[PDB]
A paper describes a structure:
Bacterial contractile injection systems (CIS) are phage tail-like macromolecular complexes that mediate cell-cell interactions by injecting effector proteins into target cells. Using [name] as a model organism, we and others previously demonstrated that [name] CIS (CISSc) mediate a form of regulated cell death, which influences the onset of sporulation and secondary metabolite production in response to exogenous stress and unknown cellular signals. Our model shows that extended CISSc particles share the conserved eCIS architecture, including the three core modules: cap, sheath tube, and baseplate.
The baseplate module comprises a heteromeric assembly of the proteins Cis1b/7/8/9/11/12. The symmetry transition from the inner tube (Cis1a, C6) to the VgrG-like spike (Cis8, C3) is adapted by two layers of the tube initiators Cis1b and Cis7. The first layer of the sheath (Cis2) is bound to the conserved gp25-like protein Cis9, which connects to the baseplate ‘wedges’ composed of Cis11 and Cis12. This is in contrast to other previously reported eCIS, whose baseplate wedge comprises only one Cis11/12 component (AlgoCIS, AFP, PVC) and a Cis11 extension forming a cage around the spike. (f) Ribbon diagrams showing a single baseplate wedge subunit, which is composed of two copies of Cis11 and one copy of Cis12. Furthermore, we did not detect any structural components that resemble tail fiber proteins. Interestingly, this analysis identified the baseplate component Cis11 as a significant hit and possible interaction partner of [name]. Importantly, such a protein-protein interaction would be consistent with our cryoEM structure, which shows a peripheral surface-exposed position of Cis11 in the baseplate complex of extended CISSc.
Author numbering:
A (entry chain n), F (entry chain o), G (entry chain m), J (entry chain p), K (entry chain l), L (entry chain k): 1 to 149
B (entry chain d), C (entry chain e), D (entry chain f), E (entry chain a), H (entry chain b), I (entry chain c): 1 to 140
Write the structure that this text describes.
């Protein structure tokens, strides 16, 4: 924003998913806008292979986007999302999602609207007795349609 | 010698004349066979005599990407009722220089089958209609 | 000239009219064949005459995900006891833009087989009922 | 439409009634063919008339882990000497919610084959007995 | 329920009585079918009657590592000239504890084929003679 | 707990299982809940290949979580579990388990209730004559049903 | 070219794509002139299996360039390019491109003309709350025919 | 006893006597079968009687690396016109120690086929001539 | 023993004489079969007699890269209508240096088929015409 | 076992196998007690997922051991073991084995009995002219039956 | 060669091929004379599986030796070589080649006479905007016949 | 050899091959005695697949020892060995070999006799204009029978 040479610097994410995924949360990543490529080996009168024609594909989606809600506090809302999906109840599990990016000052500048969220995984960090950092309750979120914007 | 002019199996030129079928994209099965007749001499064990008997030209499968000009092929095939036409085809293999290594020309063609595209929502490819071709002999 | 890229094997549109079968999801084997008759000229070795004879259309296998609207197709098949209907269906191939590349139309439709879903406790897939269909002719 | 609820091939419920066969674990081949008689109208070339004729239902292969309750199946099969009872089976496809997608049923059944477990000291898997079921009309 | 005790396909017990064939190492194809006969009611389309007639048992292929006690099997097979003997065989599947899941037995056996070892200088395996077995019924 | 920004730090594991665990249990690494996914490439009539419709799968399990009992002491209870269990005897081999997580102060907060245990492996560390650290009797407990909570 | 061997110091890129440019464009990854071989095993009357002939093949193309526009500012042309190809409209998505290499002094010396560009991928960098090194809106560009010059 | 002496399938010894065919390198298909005859007892559903009938020995495919001593086998095969000789043959299985496990012998032999080497400029292997051999019976 | 001179399957030499066919590049299927007539001696069981009857030589498939000298083959094949010459052929196997292991020779030859190149716009290879050749016996 | 924190230290290996051992020896590598995996996705009548049932498996043998005797002295027992197996003579090849683990003070506390040793591989270290390390005559020992205790 | 224990140095590459050379050439990092083997498991008479008999094969070529002309200067000689092979014109692309090696003092001693050069690949270095090293126009050259001497 | 703890030192290679050796020899590695295993999963009347007995194999061969002449001097002996093999001539190719291991003091103690050796790789090191180390003319030697002693 401020300069013609800006960078959307780090330390500025958030979300607005209806599951109360708030407060401590770091290290979301692996966002993608997948599109693969076809192959045709077209022919002509000259007999040259005619280069390599390429044509469009489906939006691959399935972008597992990994969220790391560092530290599993008394809040167990993340494990309620997956435990809901395991038995079904799509009325509450198939949640819309949004990832917010804020600029050099804490103001939103771009939003990666997520069409469908799933939360198909939840892992926990190693429980080593003698280390220093904290448990990480990493979540993997799957889509149905690709991100927008 | 000039380091020879070796054959290749990528550069080619596939065409059918007559109706506006245009230029195709992939050949297969171009073959000539004879039908030997085996007569076994009774009093001489050791082999069966081999005597040639006629020659026979096998069918050819030609494939190309499904282009809007596929209406011509269906028109040609469904013209059997009102009268068909046999144009003259060609099947030529080339090296990358664009020169000629061997040129075969089908004397008279005739449609046999047309396996259309295999639509599939999950498979990333391009539709390849297949036009089988009957044969009458090579040209010279 | 622009780039009129040809029918990708992904974008399509499959439908059946009449009985509320709805829109399908996959196609295979759409093909037209002719039965050539081979007569071997006795006095001339060198080829076998190829003469066209009739045109036939092969069956098609249409597949869709198993949805509660599968009660219609099962009812339609069993209607043959008390009178069947031949609705007229379509098969079209499109590009990404949703325009038309080549639209074929089945002149008359007759069910042949309905391979139901293959239930399996282990395999992670989605049930795909297979509804066959008997061709009768191409529209124009 | 509440984001639909398309069927899948993991959730189901397979059962046979009557004798204490219990609930099975995997289906296959559930299909309803329709025999078509092809008559070639000699007057005109371009197709072959398709006319329906009868409806035949194919066999169903049901598999389950080998459990001590397999003695019931052998008793049922070997009861053909004294008469077979023909209960009414049921094949159903579900979603993870446990609700229904499309429930089929078999009007009358008959054992056809029972391929027992394939014991093997090397391969690691569960012994899967296979029960093959003859078929009749679909219930409604 | 004591967390049940489902059958598996590793632990087993295979043996033949009578001639000192000993204990084998792998079964296959243990099966029992029914020869159904299909009759089509003329006036009632939509189904075909499934009348049950007889029952046929199929052969069993038993394999074991080649051991010096294979001379007994060849003696048994080549005894058909001077009179054969039908001992009683058993096929049982067990869980890891060594308990019983389902114990089958063969009423009367008869050799059918003996595919000997496939000797090979390269492949690193162990000779597995195969002794096919004919059948007469299940014991109870 | 103490703050709205908490972190259950790595140093708070313990295991309550019917096999007598002892003072050293130390490292404990892999623990997750996997559901997986499928693909429906459903297309309507507008011609689009449609979004990749995604539907639910079973509760994928067998998530063995490795318990590194630092020290092959005279307590051979771990190998015994493998042994009797190897020779069958599932009457004393299922042994549903539990992993305990605590705060800075040793009070349980979140417990990963288990459903079935196997102890399907037990590897000892290298025995190099001249090294420094201890001997690790790593374990590979396996589940039948996934973890709970 | 000032001296006999001054080469080309890598700090001199800039693109020339038809869509609107970017101030930074702070990376440009591998570009290739790919073309593999064939294999014949011809032997002369002498008996030797002979040197394995190597003939030719088509220029495989499909060259993917991971142009990295350091910083996702409000410039959404990159995500407008892919979102355009998601639905089609080759009239505006099949734009030829040019990569410019500049001399030791900022003058162009060599240009890699691209016959067809596609923009089949846009991937955002990880968002670690507490990290550095800004956001990278990495782009992957596909071809139809290989580069020229 | 003594940790047993288990059979293996990598050590062997293959040889033909008489004509200087020498020692071979691989064997396959050594098998004996008995053609059972199935009779359906009319009045008793429940099985089909199994009755033995004759014994039949199948052919054997022996392979070895192509060596200049292949002129002998070609001469032996082409000796049918002037009288053939059938020497005894031996097939034996061995452990690494070289001690006998089970030594079979073929009473009388006869050539059946000789699949010569499959020459190929690309494939990196060694020519393996195949000598199919007929059979009469096991020696004792 | 000079560490033997073991045969191999890379170095060879394939040629046909007479018509300017030149030297080929790959062989296959070179084989001799002797038909055996099985008579079941009714008196005694345990074995079935094996008797030799005639000796038949199978076909050979020779392949080579497609070179402009393929016009000679088509002239040879299409010379049936005017007369076919049977030139002697030769198949040989050599070691690394180029000495002889076993040289076979076909006394009389005859074309049976010529499967031309399989042109393909994507598959990177070299066109390999296949000339199937008949047979009359080995030379000595 | 001096105190309830024994952490049996790793520098105490030895083994008496039937053939003569060596004065110098170290790096007794991975020795485990592995079990297989059986999968039987069972289905009930609620239509539920069915927790993937897990069953019992054969104790899988062939636990490779990489004994590392420091250097090839004039002693050649190890190469006599393998040279004996490569020809046969199981009367002297199939020999029992026992890895001994010693207490913090050099006393035996736990022993890994091996049912059948084979010595299926002996490999020498690199012979670099200028290195400072020593030759290693690494052995690989396999089993017929898994270890005991 | 001056001393009684010469072993060459890495700093002595140069090559004369019929296409024009360049001033500085950083690398050439592949030079193979590969020939493969077989496996014959030949059996004598007494019963042993026999030694693993091995025989002789083609001197398989395709040893493209990647070359690194440090600096894509205005000299477009390399990209003209590949642009011929792409369009054919094998009369001028099938170039004979050589590689020269010199002593501790610059004088040729051993020459790797190639037999058929192809230049089947041209790849440029990453155009990082801020790095320090130069631009590498790496070339991959393929053979028909393996090297000589 | 002197103490009961011979740290038989890495720095003592040399070998005598009938084809003239080299005064200087940079490398020697990868020599072993390899034999594989069967896996019979035998069964008894108790039904336990309790053990998987293993049986003897061929003496797996083709142990590529890799000789690294410290430098490619004018001595073209190694490239004459391979160039002889490529055309055949087993009278000079199938050369016996013997790797010698020397005592702490430079005396031979153990000798690895190579029953039948024949070279198949004379790969050479990379040429970097600015590096420091030397040219390595790596040799790969193939066997027919495993090494003895």
């Amino acid at each position: 924003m401020s300069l013609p040479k800006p960078e959307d610097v780090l330390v500025a994410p958030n979300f607005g998913i209806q599951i109360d995924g708030v407060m401590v949360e770091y290290l979301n990543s692996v966002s993608n806008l997948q599109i693969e490529q076809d192959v045709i080996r077209y022919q002509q009168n000259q007999g040259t292979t005619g280069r390599n024609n390429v044509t469009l594909m489906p939006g691959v989606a399935k972008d597992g986007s990994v969220q790391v809600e560092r530290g599993m506090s008394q809040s167990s809302v993340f494990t309620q999302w997956i435990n809901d999906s395991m038995a079904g109840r799509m009325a509450t599990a198939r949640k819309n999602a949004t990832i917010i990016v804020m600029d050099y000052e804490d103001n939103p500048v771009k939003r990666w609207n997520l069409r469908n969220a799933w939360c198909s995984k939840v892992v926990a960090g190693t429980l080593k007795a003698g280390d220093t950092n904290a448990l990480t309750e990493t979540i993997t979120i799957v889509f149905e349609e690709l991100v927008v914007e | 010698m000039t380091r020879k002019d070796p054959g290749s199996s990528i550069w080619f030129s596939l065409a059918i004349d007559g109706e506006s079928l245009g230029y195709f994209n992939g050949c297969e099965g171009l073959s000539t066979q004879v039908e030997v007749e085996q007569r076994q001499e009774g009093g001489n064990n050791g082999f069966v005599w081999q005597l040639p008997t006629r020659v026979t030209y096998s069918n050819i499968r030609l494939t190309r990407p499904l282009t809007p000009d596929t209406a011509k092929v269906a028109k040609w095939i469904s013209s059997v009722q009102t009268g068909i036409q046999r144009p003259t085809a060609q099947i030529s293999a080339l090296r990358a220089d664009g020169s000629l290594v061997a040129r075969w020309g089908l004397i008279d063609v005739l449609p046999v089958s047309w396996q259309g595209p295999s639509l599939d929502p999950g498979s990333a490819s391009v539709a390849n209609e297949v036009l089988e071709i009957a044969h009458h002999g090579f040209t010279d």
